[PDB]
């Protein structure tokens, strides 16, 4: 683990008050002797006042648990680790959220505001770190308010990413800024449902079903224009049959093997 003196140091910082038996703790009897602290300020675990029983420390899973003898509900349970860095753990959690990815082009894509964004000259990682602090426990959110700690976490995350991933692999999905619609069903996935399809481009205008209505006055006047441009006549039907082929071909994101005039 670490030095014993540092363990006593952390334990004594946890207890805002001082203890009387400081000289009585040793490396082989710190789990047995009861702990009694000076009574001038209420203990940090629970407000209360003047706890009437001594505390005790136990060692489990590489950590020290503090418990007060007597009433279990009198004092709150506290666990102190002795192993690693907090920033490394925060970086591990952020990676586990699966919000920042590395592409084959050498740039990092970030999931912010229900979209995938990438910048070749701006550190979006720090913005992601600041934004994701709401999905973390209380003890981790306070550390993300300092820019230097954010830079350290960004450095750890950048060091942790080794492998690359592919993006924009589904040609049958139309992306937007608020979600993605499927071309085979017409259903519109928003939020986390759109995270599955790694789309790095968007149409630029948000989707809205209110205007996506067949029975609308705006739709009716469009058949007039389409008949003016392309009359629905038999001798031109082949041309009509061709005309929609190119027009509908613009939606997909696959390579086309023909040129149109």
């Amino acid at each position: 683990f670490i030095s014993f003196e540092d363990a006593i140091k952390r334990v004594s910082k946890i207890f805002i008050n001082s203890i009387i038996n400081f000289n009585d703790l040793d490396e082989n009897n710190f789990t047995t002797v009861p702990l009694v602290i000076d009574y001038v300020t209420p203990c940090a675990l629970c407000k209360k006042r003047s706890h009437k029983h001594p505390h005790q420390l136990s060692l489990e899973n590489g950590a020290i648990r503090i418990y007060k003898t007597g009433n279990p509900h009198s004092c709150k349970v506290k666990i102190v680790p002795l192993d690693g860095n907090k920033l490394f753990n925060i970086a591990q959690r952020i990676l586990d959220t699966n919000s920042v990815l590395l592409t084959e082009r050498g740039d990092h894509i970030v999931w912010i505001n229900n979209s995938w964004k990438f910048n070749s000259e701006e550190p979006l990682i720090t913005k992601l770190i600041l934004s994701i602090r709401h999905q973390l426990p209380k003890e981790y959110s306070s550390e993300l308010l300092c820019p230097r700690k954010r830079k350290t976490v960004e450095a750890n995350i950048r060091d942790m990413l080794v492998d690359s991933v592919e993006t924009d692999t589904y040609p049958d999905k139309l992306p937007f800024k608020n979600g993605v619609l499927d071309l085979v069903d017409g259903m519109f996935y928003s939020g986390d449902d759109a995270k599955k399809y790694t789309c790095t481009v968007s149409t630029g205008f948000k989707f809205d079903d209110t205007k996506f209505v067949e029975d609308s006055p705006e739709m009716e006047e469009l058949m007039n224009i389409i008949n003016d441009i392309q009359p629905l006549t038999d001798e031109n039907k082949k041309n009509r049959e061709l005309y929609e082929k190119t027009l509908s071909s613009c939606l997909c994101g696959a390579t086309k093997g023909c040129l149109t005039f």
């Binding site: 899973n61 349970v77 999905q135």
Partner: protein, 214 residues
């Protein structure tokens, strides 16, 4: 893959330390194979019996639900328990989904949704301890996957700070694993058992070998 193949028979032991040869011999005094209803009848009519659940042959069928065990030697109030269980669920889901995406080549969002949709919890009758088994109903994987993920689970347990997360024991993921049947006596001279959860009033929601892919 399995498709039609869905486990419905339940393999159950009766005492810890089963003799080796009698397992292949399948002696009725230590090994039983039941269904849900008759197993419920067998645990209802005999209240002092001890039952342990395990698999029989993983060489041909080794797909099980995700199960974890937690045990802490302290008492917690209701609100702190709820906060801890919520944070524990979030962290475990994130870790498992990340491992599945990195190694198994699965989809992060599907794993997260499946594991956060349905899960079953238990409680222990002891007042001074907080222990429970958690079963993820809608997630299925092989035993070797759990063996591989044991290291990541141990790392998460060491790194975290939530009291529930620090109490995860990774020793359960090993060859010929066994689990205690809910609502069953552990020792002949011990009255500590596990109880139900109001969300789930059915026995089949508390077994990690009962597979049914909906």
């Amino acid at each position: 893959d399995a498709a039609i193949r869905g486990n419905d028979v339940i393999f159950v032991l009766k005492t810890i330390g089963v003799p080796s040869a009698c397992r292949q011999n399948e002696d009725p005094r230590f090994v039983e194979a039941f269904k849900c209803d008759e197993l419920e009848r067998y645990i209802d009519n005999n209240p002092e019996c001890t039952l342990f659940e395990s698999l029989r042959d993983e060489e041909a069928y080794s797909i099980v639900r995700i199960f974890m065990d937690v045990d802490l030697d302290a008492c917690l109030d209701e609100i702190d328990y709820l906060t801890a269980i919520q944070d524990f669920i979030i962290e475990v889901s994130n870790c498992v989904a990340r491992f599945a995406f990195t190694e198994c080549g699965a989809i992060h969002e599907n794993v997260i949704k499946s594991m956060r949709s349905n899960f079953s919890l238990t409680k222990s009758t002891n007042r001074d301890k907080t222990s429970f088994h958690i079963i993820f109903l809608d997630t299925y994987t092989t035993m070797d996957t759990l063996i591989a993920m044991k290291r990541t689970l141990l790392e998460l347990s060491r790194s975290s700070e939530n009291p529930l997360t620090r109490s995860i024991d990774t020793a359960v993921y090993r060859r010929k694993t066994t689990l205690r049947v809910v609502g069953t006596r552990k020792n002949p001279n011990c009255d500590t058992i596990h109880v139900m959860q109001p969300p789930h009033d059915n026995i089949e929601d508390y077994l990690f070998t009962y597979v049914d892919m909906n």
